Amino acid sequence: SRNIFVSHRFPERQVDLGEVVMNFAEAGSPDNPALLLLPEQTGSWWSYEPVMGLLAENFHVFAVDIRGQGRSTWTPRRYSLDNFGNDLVRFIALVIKRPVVVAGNSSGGLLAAWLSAYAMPGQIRAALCEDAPFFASELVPAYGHSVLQAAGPAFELYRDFLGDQWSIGDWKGFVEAAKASPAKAMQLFPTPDEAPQNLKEYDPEWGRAFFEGTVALHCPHDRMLSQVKTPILITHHARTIDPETGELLGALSDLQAEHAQDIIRSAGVRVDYQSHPDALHMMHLFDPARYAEILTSWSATLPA
Amino acid sequence: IFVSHRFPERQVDLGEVVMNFAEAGSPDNPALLLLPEQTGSWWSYEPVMGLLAENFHVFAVDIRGQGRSTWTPRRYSLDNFGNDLVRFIALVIKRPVVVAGNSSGGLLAAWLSAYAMPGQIRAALCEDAPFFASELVPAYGHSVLQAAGPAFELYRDFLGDQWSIGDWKGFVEAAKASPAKAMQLFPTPDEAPQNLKEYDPEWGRAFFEGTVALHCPHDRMLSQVKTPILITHHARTIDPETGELLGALSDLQAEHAQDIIRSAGVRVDYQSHPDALHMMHLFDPARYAEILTSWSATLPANDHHHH
């Protein structure tokens, strides 16, 4: 329907980028440094709603709905990291019109790195990659677990039961397949009787693109990390190896994080790594005060 | 390996790609962005630019993976090509443009009409563009495997991504031996020509393997165009034995392309030039210049873009 939205504590506006009309919320005062917040997959801008007040003390915050999510345009067959990233390049150029710190969670953290490497010159001051699945979200990664061995199971179910643009919509089937899944990474997957608000706002073709290896086909992660041009902060939250299946539970393994750091270091840019092994994947949502402190303290070490 | 040209060249950093280009004419005339064919550098337009600079502010570009522009391993997609050009318009031209492209560049002219930033594109000239026929899974008619694919396969197999194999002699041998009717007229000089020395053959891999437009199905892209389109349709024939398409697109593919654009509610003009060579802008430059100039003069705001 694309008519299922609810109210939020910050006003929302939309901007025509040329193909996507991007929805976003704004917080904070425009005399403060600009901060672009990129949600996790299945998450709308309001994934950041609880933390935006804290960040508004110090930043001019723009939290966006990425294409295929929230009130931003759904674009069948066009889901790629490059299209996600170029939408954001346009958003910075058309809306923000200043250099930004960009912070993103999970797939959004992939896009924060993408911008550090591939944005227009001067657009990106620095990038915060909050529990980003470097390598582990690729179909054939250079290192470690692939998407099939990590976050893939839920993506397969989104595709098979919800379908591209919610064209199947079989939430009841999805829940019963999620409960029956032998993937240990599905063990704590929430299975409410009714689809949650964030999933109702989510184009499940996103999940297809991740599961099928098309989203990053043209953006191998080893190459993209070698092309970053700004300081990078990597936060690395909970992760474990399942002792029955060998699945990666979490965003990326220790080995994948080591390689991501090594590649960035070899590009000659500043890289900082923080391991928070008892934090949840979406620390900006489940521990806003800790996330805000991490981001604010690191941002204060960046050159003006 | 570059050679001299009669228009000075400049480079601009788009962020990932540093784009090389040649500029001619006065900014008092409408801005015109010229996009070469695959394997062609900006100077595919060098013989015709003098004619066009009489009436346009001309920018002829090296697309990523070609000429002096950055080669970008594993990143060759219509979207990445097109977004470079969005950035070029925003950073260099800073005015709305008429965009004219040959072959793959014509695909990218249509791409810009659909997907550029608001207001950047006034109109698109698609000069013998392989709509559908350059897809691996086209909505209509021949796939690339039954059209331009044979040469692309040989580029991949003998020249290699970023010229990493570089077996020009084996390439020529295989071209001569090809069973494809579409290779019958392919030039096989003893040394690689300048345009191909400037070409990253991963371009050919991306077309042959169906990765270049995986995320840009042509039926959907044509349905999203937002500006007037001029389609020129040069020589084409279907081989009666192999069914190969010799040419850029078939009559059936051109019919559907027009129909989809018309259904988008935009102006579309179609000119069939059945005896014209694929690169008319290079091999019949006076004719191409008249087509482009006469058509541009019919566009709304032609007067707004003279100063």
Residue numbers in the entry:
A (entry chain B): 23 to 326
B (entry chain A): 26 to 332
From the paper:
Zearalenone (ZEN) is a mycoestrogenic polyketide produced by Fusarium graminearum and other phytopathogenic members of the genus Fusarium. ZenA cleaves zearalenone [ZEN, (S,E)-14,16-dihydroxy-3-methyl-3,4,5,6,9,10-hexahydro-1H-benzo[c]oxacyclotetradecine-1,7(8H)-dione] to hydrolyzed zearalenone [HZEN, (S,E)-2,4-dihydroxy-6-(10-hydroxy-6-oxoundec-1-en-1-yl)benzoic acid], which decarboxylates spontaneously to decarboxylated hydrolyzed zearalenone [DHZEN, (S,E)-1-(3,5-dihydroxyphenyl)-10-hydroxyundec-1-en-6-one]. Furthermore, we report site-directed mutagenesis as well as structural analysis of the dimeric ZenARe of R. erythropolis and the more thermostable, tetrameric ZenAScfl of Streptomyces coelicoflavus with and without bound ligands. The X-ray crystal structures not only revealed canonical features of α/β hydrolases with a cap domain including a Ser-His-Asp catalytic triad but also unusual features including an uncommon oxyanion hole motif and a peripheral, short antiparallel β-sheet involved in tetramer interactions.
For ZenARe, the calculated molar mass of the 6xHis-tagged subunit is 37.103 g/mol (assuming cleavage of the N-terminal fMet), and the observed molar mass of 71 kDa indicated the presence of a dimer. Crystals of space group C 2 2 21 with 2 subunits in the asymmetric unit and 46% solvent content, yielded a dataset of 1.46 Å resolution. The structure was solved by molecular replacement, with ZenAScfl as a search model. The structures of ZenARe and ZenAScfl were found to be very similar, with a RMSD of 0.43 Å (over 502 equiv Cα atoms), with the catalytic triad and oxyanion hole residues superimposing almost perfectly. Most differences between the structures are related to the cap domains. Similar to ZenAScfl, ZenARe shows mostly negative electrostatic surface potential, especially at the active site. While ZenARe has a similar dimeric interface, composed of 30 residues over an interface area of 1195 Å2 (ΔG = −9.4 kcal mol–1, KD = 0.13 μM at 25 °C, according to Prodigy), six amino acids are different in the region corresponding to the tetramer forming interfaces between subunits A/C of ZenAScfl and five amino acids are different in the interface region between the subunits A/D. These differences lead to the abrogation of tetramer stabilizing interactions and corroborate the SEC-MALS result, which showed that ZenARe is a dimer in solution. The catalytic triad of ZenARe was therefore defined as Ser-128 – His-303 – Asp-153.
